[PDB]
Amino acid sequence: FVNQHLCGSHLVEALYLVCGERGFFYTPK
Amino acid sequence: GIVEQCCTSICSLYQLENYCN
């Protein structure tokens, strides 16, 4: 799932799945 | 930042993990 173009909710979903209990920061700026 | 790396170009696990806490 990670090796593709990931935008918006698709990118946040990938961060959520990869980062698990660490969580993550989403900084589109 | 992440949009340039993963949305407008092809993402990678390596790059995604840079955004994990």
Swiss-Prot record, chain B:
Gene: INS
Protein name in the entry: Insulin A chain
Positions in coiled-coil regions: none
Interval of the full protein contained in this chain: 90 to 110 of 110
Disulfide bonding pattern of the chain: C6-C11
